[PDB]
């Protein structure tokens, strides 16, 4: 688990401006305000030198292709792109994993995500984010905030692989018809 | 709470606000896109009117927010545009963040009747909230009927905050009894108030001075002076008590372009404890009976 | 998203009861409504029977009359309060018996006192406003640069009303 | 949003001790801060222990 | 076939739910794999069919 990890392995993200807007042009139509910031993003990034990651949401009404333009970001940004569902979940282990010791005890599906794409700088969207139901054993939202920290996420471990890892280049991508019943912190 | 000594945060000026960010901020946030201050400039009127219009609270987050996004957006323009160097200005500003987000945000520049701004100590710093009385049914419920004049509330009433309205109500039918016997308007009517949330509920009672002001002015019809604000706690004799969150509420008031202000002569030193350029543009009233604010609210 | 609903007012006690009968004209209220709804209702029938009496003291309709009210649920709870327009518009138009002015939609929070708050989600509200074939919209004047924030493409046919005060809005239902 | 974290980290330079935040707000189960009784799967112990087995010192800012 | 999907408890520790979305995912169906076996499996020419006698009860992300 841990050497399949992608230390220090970044895809070669591309970084031609009018090349990615020719693309998320024809992706998808309109969306005029999130091209405009993702191409802020890159232009950033490009002046920025080395490759960075914030983290963003995508909150409108369904049917919308959300999932679709974080697919075509992905794409246009040559990273590499996963999603992950969190509505109705109560168990943060699908965040921090296991402890690793119980026989056949799973990382984190961000491990397994790292472990997917092969590098350090992928695309990772988490959908229904508002859904969450943070019941019994649960609270994940505390987890949600430790893994998108921008400050703390650049140490975030799981309990499966105690050792941490840098989360300074990826992209989160959230998404939620509505922005109240999501945690305020988040 | 009582293990620890609890100091105080109360808030920037909005003066404040503009040194930290373009002393503290600003640069972190430069620094950060790896901007520099030759291609990327901002001046003190842009920032001042970002304050003004794109942010309102007592925290500084949202102006963190917004000065990252007009940096990152010259960032493109210079990358991307041709600007090799970005020179920013109100006239710009539009295009850079977009068009005003707040107006002035008081509610009524003109206070009609019954309606009266109050500073409250909220959570998240002050706030001004506009007291709200009404008229729930026809005084001429019967031209004989001497029926008691009962009150309704809403907003989420808590228990002081029942007895607060019921100690103000009654202090407020003493009042005009002795001041105008002849008027019977609080006396038979049936009058609905609101009190918008907010303030803490320690610091609840500092609107019954506001109460009874605006019952007053919903009793005999003349609108409350502009630009002034009031706020403390009767202890059924028209005696004013002190309160809490002086501070920031007089922050707020500033905010709120209110010129004139009433406070309790007990935290009279609190005010004067406070910078000179806090309380620039406006005319404290230090009182410790309510008998006085009548005529401050009411000269003529 | 968006969507657009038919707020009724309907009366479940005959008018005149006992002409010299004074009780007062107790609401009923439906949409599976949460407290603060509960309280944005009391605050909208309040200023309904302050203007009524501004501008019709003869009439005692809205007074002494028992009035039932539905709005229809779906709404977030966030933007349930911006009913309060509508409210007061259907309990008005119920009052003198006027309908309303046709394919004419409103939306936003009142002070008690007529004057209107601003309210979130616009851009949706008028996307299913236009898919709701309505010509006339009348909106806060401060959510107005909101609207503007649109595309023209979407705005045709829009015939928009910015106001403040209540006093505009019912000139504008009530042209007479 | 005053800096009262940034405070609490600046006082925490200054006195050259470690810097650490706890979130108590809406926290009712007294186990985060107590852990577990060590017996069931995967049991953990209290946020303390966390904080001082990353900050390494005995003498951190909490 | 699934027989009666509008008789599902979803109760503590079940939630199968969560498992028949992953397993008839457009996507994720492709590579589904379970606790036993930890290996990903495709399931894209499988044919599913679904029995109950009921619609509104059935969950809406099913
Ligand atoms: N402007 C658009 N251009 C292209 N496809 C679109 C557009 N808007 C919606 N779609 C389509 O709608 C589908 C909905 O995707 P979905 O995962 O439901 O996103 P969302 O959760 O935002 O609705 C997508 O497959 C996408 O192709
Ligand atoms: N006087 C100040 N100088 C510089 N930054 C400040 C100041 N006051 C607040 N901030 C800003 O506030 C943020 C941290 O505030 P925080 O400690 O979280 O306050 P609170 O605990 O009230 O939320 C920092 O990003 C910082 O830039």
Redesign the pocket.
Known sequence: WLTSIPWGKYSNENLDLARAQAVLEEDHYGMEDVKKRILEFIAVSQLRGSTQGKILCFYGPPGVGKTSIARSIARALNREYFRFSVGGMTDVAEIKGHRRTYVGAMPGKIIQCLKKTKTENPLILIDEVDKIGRGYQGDPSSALLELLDPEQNANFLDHYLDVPVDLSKVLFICTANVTDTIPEPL | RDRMEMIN?SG?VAQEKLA?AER??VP?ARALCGLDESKAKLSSDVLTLLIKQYCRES???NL?KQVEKVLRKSAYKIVSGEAESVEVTPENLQDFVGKPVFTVERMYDVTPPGVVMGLAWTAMGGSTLFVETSLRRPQDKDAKGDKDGSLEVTGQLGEVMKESARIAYTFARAFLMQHAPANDYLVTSHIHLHVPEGATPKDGPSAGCTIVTALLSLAMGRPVRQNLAMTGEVSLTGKILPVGGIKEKTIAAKRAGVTCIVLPAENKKDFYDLAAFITEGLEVHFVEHYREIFDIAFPD
């Open positions: 945060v920037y930290i503290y901020l972190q925290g500084v987050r963190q």
